């Protein structure tokens, strides 16, 4: 199947022509941070010049901000060396977009990824419940096959259908190698994907959607795992009202 690096999505004209030949996924508006449809420091002791030369970690495993899933600000005692500003600095894993046999486009590791590595943030338009129902009605009228809604918090759904980044290509697996982590950046909640184990180079990156299905028919799962649940969404259908947070 064809593949494409994250640099290929920065040129809209070249991408739109590759899409006509099926070498790249269908066009969407590339964004690097959530767009709303309707508009203290940690206590880590700063690392010395010797500690940074050795390779020691600033705001590592012990950081108090890291523990409450809060990213540090520019005012961090470790300053520019703080390793707890990954969403802000876009310190993404090396990933490529690939065409899968039956799930549409997907994401794959371009390098070996250690466990608990930040992959990408799940970006998109943040909708309230009325706006979410409006998009549900539009996508139902369009007969869309793929769905890009991610529950963020009460009355906040991220919709990556029209605007988002390459995280919108992460497929579901019943035995996944990634998970979401909800992080607070400047008081705002964000969802990111993180590896849950060592992911070898060339492997597809997947997560458990824990899908809340409002559709009448459930989508069959093609994850190919021995423990496959057979469907995205399980047995029960919830109402449009309940699926959206």
């Amino acid at each position: 199947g064809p593949s494409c690096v994250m640099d290929d999505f920065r040129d809209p004209q070249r991408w739109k022509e590759c899409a006509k030949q099926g070498k790249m996924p269908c066009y969407f508006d590339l964004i690097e941070e959530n767009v709303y449809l309707t508009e203290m420091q940690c206590e880590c002791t700063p690392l010395s010049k010797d500690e940074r030369a050795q390779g020691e970690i600033a705001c590592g495993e012990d950081c108090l901000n890291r523990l409450l899933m809060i990213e540090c600000s520019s005012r961090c005692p470790n300053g520019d060396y703080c390793s707890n500003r990954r969403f802000q600095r876009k310190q993404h894993a090396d990933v490529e977009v690939i065409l899968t046999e039956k799930k549409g486009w997907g994401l794959r590791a371009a390098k070996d990824l250690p466990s608990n590595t930040f992959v990408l943030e799940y970006c998109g338009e943040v909708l309230d419940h009325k706006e979410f129902k409006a998009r549900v009605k539009e996508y139902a009228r369009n007969k869309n096959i793929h769905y890009y809604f991610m529950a963020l918090k009460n009355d906040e759904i991220i919709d990556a259908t029209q605007k988002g980044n390459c995280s919108r290509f992460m497929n579901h697996s019943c035995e996944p190698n990634c998970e979401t982590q909800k992080w607070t950046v400047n008081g705002q909640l964000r969802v990111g994907f993180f590896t849950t184990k060592l992911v070898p180079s060339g492997s597809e990156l997947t997560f458990d959607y824990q899908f809340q299905r409002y559709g009448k028919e459930a989508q069959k799962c093609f994850c190919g795992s021995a423990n496959c649940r057979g469907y995205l969404g399980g047995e029960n259908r919830v109402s449009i009202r309940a699926a959206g947070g």
């Binding site: 909800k182 959607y209 559709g215 699926a243």
Partner: peptide, 12 residues
């Protein structure tokens, strides 16, 4: 409608 749903992040 026919298809559709919402992905739910793990409880964090």
């Amino acid at each position: 409608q026919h298809l559709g749903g919402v992905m739910k992040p793990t409880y964090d």
